[PDB]
Design a protein around this ligand. Structure first.
Ligand SMILES: [Br-]
Ligand SMILES: [Br-]
Ligand SMILES: [Br-]
Ligand SMILES: [Br-]
Ligand SMILES: [Br-]
Ligand SMILES: [Br-]
Lengths: 144, 144
């Protein structure tokens, strides 16, 4: 369960190869990459706190789908349109568990991991909670 | 809808970048890579026929989730343990459609795309239908 928050960009290929190297006997790999939509974003985490939340999310995915492995890399800092934001990769013996766990981790990440976005309000620059709400995902995964 | 069957190996990064370059305004990308499990595999397709089936699968994904784009690269030939077999990548405005369409394409590919595996039987070398059966996926996607 390799989880990282960084400012540098990540290499999906390299992260996928390392996950496979840690899981020599299973071969179904699902991944997700989110990128700043071209519709600047300044993202900040809570050092230590946010990583622990991501570790808890990956651990819960492992409880629900025994035998998977999970990698998460999330960026922070000043991110431009088209920049990569986050990648989640999971591996399993079969594609069903790989897809489900990858989407579960993304849903839980987007709704619960502590991140903040900088926004300029009339008072001035503020940091606004970047967590999303997804009520259909919560019902899907059995939580209220 | 870029669909290819080839003997050469593929580069997930390069394929993902090209898909994003064809979809400048949406940023949620889901992908799947299947690899020969380390438990040689000789895979063959039906030239023309198999590509058309993959195109039909991607078109149906586009009918179900308007606004997505889909890329499929499938390998054939003599594939060793740990070799990449197949990649499917989808992009959408939001992660829900990206994940669902990617899994749908993989399920339909694995159960319906014409591929054959070489096997040595008592009579001798034979080519056996490599399509899988998934009855839970068929129910999930509304087909009987
Ligand atoms: Br790490
Ligand atoms: Br995202
Ligand atoms: Br599979
Ligand atoms: Br092509
Ligand atoms: Br596969
Ligand atoms: Br998203």
């Amino acid at each position: 369960a390799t989880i990282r928050i960084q400012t540098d960009d990540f290499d999906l290929n390299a992260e996928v190869a390392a996950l496979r190297a840690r899981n020599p006997k299973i071969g179904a790999l699902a991944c997700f990459v989110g990128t700043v939509r071209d519709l600047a974003m300044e993202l900040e985490h809570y050092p230590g706190m946010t990583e622990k939340a991501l570790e808890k999310i990956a651990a819960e995915a492992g409880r629900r789908w025994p035998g998977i492995d999970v990698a998460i890399v999330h960026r922070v800092g000043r991110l431009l349109p088209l920049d990569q934001i986050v990648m989640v990769a999971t591996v399993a013996s079969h594609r069903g568990d790989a897809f489900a766990s990858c989407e579960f981790v993304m849903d839980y990440l987007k709704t619960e991991a502590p991140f903040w976005k900088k926004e300029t309000t009339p008072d001035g620059e503020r940091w606004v909670d970047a967590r999303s709400t997804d009520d259909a995902a919560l019902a899907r995964w059995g939580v209220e």
